[PDB]
Subunit: 751 residues, 2 copies
């Protein structure tokens, strides 16, 4: 049983820390993180702080390899992981008063307040420095520009109760360490040109370059050009109870590929910086708010009867919007977004099978770009297939640059959920948008390459009457080197049948794509044969899928017999023990059933839920929400509510005790999923939007917003009524409690 | 693929000879010409400075260190710190200088080089002529490890100059030696000179182990040095033209593997034995070693007529088996490369119990019993290992010298219980040859209860508890990982349960204080009976096949004949996971338990399983060819039997694996004897009666082997027309030959 550590104020539209909690230093850094997909910054202190901290600034796709190989005698095992790297700290300052440096870990201060405005991404930290004979009220404000994402803005104000002098230094610091251990940047240039100062830096080996420039609305008293560091010095005189303020403008221009002439990069960065400096910080808060107002009109969720859950869901939506908005078809979502170092800014199968749906119903360009990230890493997926003695495209378990970054053969050599996950993403995207051009130009190539991998890594049995995957692991990582994992075989067959439907569709031109992929008539015949002979362990009488061959007959352990002194499992059990029971980590059978809920009857879902849920430890960000969604679909209301539990609060109240490392991106997407797919009962079936709304015992009502076929729908669910509204004039047919209505303006349906 | 001979050594029946120095075989020769007396071993590294590629290697059985740093793991039951037998004092080290030119065969001019290992004495002799300035100096360097008083080593150095000249000779004890070519695993204690004796005392970094090395000679030195962890005797010699000048070095090494020996007593014991040893000439110590080898050749020598190559090989193999172990110490064991190198860390594997033991069972009861006592004396380590695997009782490790798991690959160390059933089988095999009541009462029963406790705790019931098995395991076939119902595992476990059951029901044994001390209750015995009865055994009464593991038969088929040579070895050419998801087998798994229990399986059972598993078997391990040869012989497949024998006696001499540079292959050496006596000889004990079914090696006119059963030293000669069996004992031994029961008194002459 996990517990909340409630230390933050509950407001509907803001996260507020009342007083500084030093014990929550890194938790606060994670939670108050700013992000515009292109870049992100932990809520680390601008000024020197000598306590526990993780300074983190990241650019989506700016990465390095491990400094040395982990050796291996064996092929297909990763010798060199890679990770999104700590980049220039462009919020860094130093404040000195009468030889006393501001450092909230050593100095005396009061009335400390930390604010994240979910309406604007305004991050405001306020405190009163008791320094010698002065009370100095300091307010430091920051923004990442949501539209012009290369830009960040900082405002600093001082108000002394007496006349006094201070020194403010503004730094661009590219000497930052990653893994708290090494700097992954080499110097190229530092420069001051007119009122603008900046550096150009380059990664150790990935051939990536970054130029960071700043300028302010105040003439500096001096400046410094050091190695990978530039500083503007201000000698400021404060009049008693007169506010002195400065605004810092930052532009960061990255080249992720390494072909950009650095003189163009410098000129681009300086042009954009100059343009941005023409606006007040107050007007750039408004610019950010207008961006957030569009995304709240498309997707905001109202919860009545829980101030706690209202803040949590709106915080989750804010962090989903910060993680991704379709800025770059070569960007993806990390397991912690850009909010820390743990999980290396890596994409996992979670992006396609859990994060994608939020984007499908809010932002077509976002959803499309998450799939284009994978298109644009096809070549790495093909190289990875060759590392597994296969052909086609094997999408990796963990990656930013497209190559396998997971150095555990137990997962990297056995789990093809990322490959069928990219298939699923394309399928889901086409179910929502039917984007003929994406499928013609990108989707067919991707489906053919993935199919080629599954056809080469899949094998016929001894006598060639069956096709399956041998030596695999499904989503449930407590089963290693099993045969006939139903998730693996089912999703591979779905891919085969989807590719086969697309190649038979004559509105698509396939001859050059199949020729380019090396996909022949023999291949197509093998693919049809492999689809027909795929082992699916399914029983017509019990309605059960068997998770893998031999699963039902495994030694039984009742999860209720596992003590608290014994968790997590990997910390108290011998490594091998967890594999040789019927304890499941997360949805496996229930995963493919979630992904294809519309093809399973009430009784199939009930039968599989009743076998598998009681055997599931829920040791995954993915598990509770999936179980809640299935529970709601089969009318198990108590299970549905219990699994939802603290879905909106996991980071805010640090239920996992590791929010210090960064936010939990999949758990955040899960909260939206649990509300809309779970309580909402959202399903697209025969190209018609279906709702089956059920209650959360804790809420008087909830309301969500989704777009289908260019109709922005509002769905409000209370004890008595489902209220569905839209503003378009034309009929959208919708299914509610399995009956068909024609939505024009409003439908009120009695429960 | 097909392995080829690199034949560079002369063929003689009683010696290994290198004619001329082969620089490219430098480390191969070091391995092949290794001396060992179980207590200690030395590689055949050059005594003088050698600046070519070499592995200097002196080891003491059970003198070991841990890795300097932990390999980190977030998981439990995975080894964080391996251990290994450490390079120790180099006590053969010399330096020779003539007119400021140092003897080093990688630099100097030399001619008429000859290297000799005499298989009848263990005399290791190197002769060469040093062409230095105006002088030709014939150098002979001779050495011995004492096979009886195993603390002692001897070295003799002679010089013969064609002109009057002066040379300098330095004798070193050097304990600054590296292991893994990186680090010295010894700390200084003391260097000392007491009378005509000079020596050092050193201690291991961590393991609380100490050694005293002392030397003295038959010549007053001109000077000496005591440096940190090395002592030197300096000799300023004047050579008279055509007059041989010889010196003899006596060495005594006293070790404390446990750490409770007072170092003043260690030193005094070392000096007392060094002194006693110094009374004997080198020539008399060669005769002493020959007296020891004559005894072992009278017990076990094998004659081969029609193949000088096989005659040399088999006698070389017997020589290394006698060097590896002779019952010197019940805390000593056989390493995978004996004491001939660093690779495999002087570690014991399940091979000791299931492959190496039988040679000792038929030649030397004290050696056979000591191999099992090594395991009795590492019971506590095996119990800690069972706990690391969330089990109870004793889980004997995959790889160890000190009793702790040294294998850091969970894929083997967490999955393979062949070492635990291997100790069970050794106890059983030992009792089957010697029926040693006192061994079983004082030791055996305890070991069997502890192993059974582990098997019953790591073993689990299936979902509805109608079946018992091992889940998430690996059998001897390492190409099958995290399988269920591995037949070797279940079969051998069931055999352990039934043996303990039968020993507990033998009222000539007192099984009260032992079961109590082990915590083995009437309730554990009821579980053991129920697990024994419900044990999953995938056996088809129609086909007579065992299925290697659940789902084995239905796996994707790969025909081994389609694997190209460019793809060998597999681990270097195939993606890590790929070998696991085929029906390609590394080594005997089903055929392993069928071999260990050949007496219970019919001709038809062996042929059905042989026909299914032999053609799926890659024969990777040095373990595989001999087992298949033995089973092939048993079922009348003479061509297969002879093909699988192949180069069995030559694997190290002609370096078929291309890694004899690292050390000799101990299991491969044992397997040659096994292939001859279990294979061609058809040796088998059934209902306590010795059986023979002698068949022909196509390449041999005759072969002859010697074995001891029920205190009868038996000689078995097999030619084309006759089996002749002889002994000198006066009493009747019943013996079964070609399925007929004779009473052997002095001589049996049986037509074929």
């Amino acid at each position: 049983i996990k517990i909340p550590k409630r230390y933050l104020e509950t407001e509907p539209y803001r996260i507020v820390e009342n007083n500084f909690h030093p014990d929550k230093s890194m938790v606060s850094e994670s939670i108050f993180s700013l992000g515009n997909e292109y870049s992100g910054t932990r809520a680390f202190f601008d000024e020197t702080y000598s306590g526990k901290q993780l300074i983190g600034t990241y650019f989506n796709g700016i990465y390095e390899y491990a400094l040395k190989d982990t050796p291996s005698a064996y092929l297909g095992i990763v010798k060199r992981t890679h990770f999104t790297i700590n980049s220039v700290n462009f919020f860094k300052i130093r404040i000195i008063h009468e030889d006393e440096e501001l450092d909230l870990n050593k100095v005396k201060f009061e009335d400390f307040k930390r604010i994240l405005d979910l309406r604007s991404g305004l991050y405001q930290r306020t405190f009163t420095w008791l320094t010698n004979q002065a009370k100095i009220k300091i307010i430091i404000s920051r923004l990442l520009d949501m539209s012009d994402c290369e830009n960040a803005y900082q405002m600093i104000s001082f108000e002394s109760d007496i006349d006094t002098d201070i020194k403010l230094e503004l730094h661009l610091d590219s000497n930052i360490l990653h893994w708290g251990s090494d700097c992954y940047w080499n110097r190229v240039k530092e420069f001051k040109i007119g009122n603008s100062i900046g550096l150009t830096v380059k990664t150790l080996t990935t051939n990536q370059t970054l130029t960071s420039v700043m300028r302010t609305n105040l003439k500096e008293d001096s400046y410094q050009l050091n190695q990978k560091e530039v500083i503007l010095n201000y000698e400021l005189t404060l009049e008693a109870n007169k506010e002195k303020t400065i605004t810092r403008y930052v532009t960061n221009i990255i080249d992720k590929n390494g072909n950009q002439k650095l003189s163009q990069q410098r000129d681009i960065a300086l042009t954009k910086l100059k343009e941005a400096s023409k606006f007040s910080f107050a007007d750039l808060v408004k610019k950010n708010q207008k961006f957030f107002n569009h995304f709240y009109q498309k997707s905001d969720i109202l919860i009545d009867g829980s101030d706690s859950d209202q803040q949590g869901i709106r915080y989750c939506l804010f962090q989903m919007i910060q993680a991704y908005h379709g800025f770059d078809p070569t960007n993806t979502i990390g397991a912690k977004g850009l909010t820390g170092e743990a999980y290396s800014g890596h994409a996992f199968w979670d992006n396609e099978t859990y994060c994608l749906p939020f984007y499908l119903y809010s932002n077509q360009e976002a959803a499309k770009d998450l799939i284009m990230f994978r298109y644009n890493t096809l070549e790495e997926a093909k190289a990875r297939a060759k590392e597994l003695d296969s052909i086609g495209a094997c999408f990796p378990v963990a990656t930013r640059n497209g190559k396998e970054a997971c150095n555990l053969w137990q997962h990297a050599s056995t789990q093809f959920q990322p490959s069928t996950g990219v298939f699923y993403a394309i399928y889901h995207y086409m179910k929502i948008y039917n984007d003929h051009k994406f499928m013609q130009n990108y989707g067919i190539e991707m489906l053919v390459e993935i199919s080629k991998f599954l056809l080469s890594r899949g094998q016929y049995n001894q006598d060639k009457t069956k096709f399956s995957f041998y030596g695999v692991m499904g989503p449930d990582e407590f089963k290693l080197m099993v045969n006939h994992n139903t998730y693996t075989n089912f999703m591979a067959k779905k891919c085969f049948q989807y590719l086969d439907k697309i190649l038979a569709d004559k509105t698509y031109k396939t001859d050059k794509i199949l020729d380019k992929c090396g996909f022949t008539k023999k291949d197509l015949a093998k693919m049809k044969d492999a689809s027909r002979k795929m082992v699916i362990l399914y029983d017509k009488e019990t309605l059960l899928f068997e998770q893998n061959d031999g699963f039902f007959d495994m030694p039984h352990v009742d999860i209720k017999t596992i003590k608290d002194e014994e968790m997590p499992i990997y910390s108290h059990w011998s490594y091998d023990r967890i594999y040789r029971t019927d304890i499941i980590k997360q949805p496996d059978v229930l995963m493919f059933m979630f992904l294809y809920m519309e093809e399973f009857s009430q009784k199939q879902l009930l039968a599989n839920y009743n076998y598998y849920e009681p055997r599931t430890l829920h040791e995954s960000s993915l598990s509770p929400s999936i179980h809640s969604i299935i529970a709601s679909k089969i009318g198990l209301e108590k299970d549905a509510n219990n699994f939802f539990g603290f879905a909106t609060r996991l980071d805010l109240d640090d239920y996992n005790n590791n929010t210090c490392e960064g936010i939990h991106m999949t758990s955040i997407a899960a909260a939206w999923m649990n509300i809309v797919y779970g309580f909402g009962g959202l399903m697209i079936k025969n190209d018609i939007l279906n709702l089956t709304p059920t209650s959360n015992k804790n809420w008087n009502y909830y309301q969500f917003k989704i777009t289908f076929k260019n109709h922005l729908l509002t769905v409000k669910v209370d004890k008595d009524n489902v209220i569905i509204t839209k503003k378009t004039k034309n009929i959208l047919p919708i299914n509610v409690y399995g009956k068909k209505y024609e939505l024009i303006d409003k439908l009120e349906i009695k429960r």
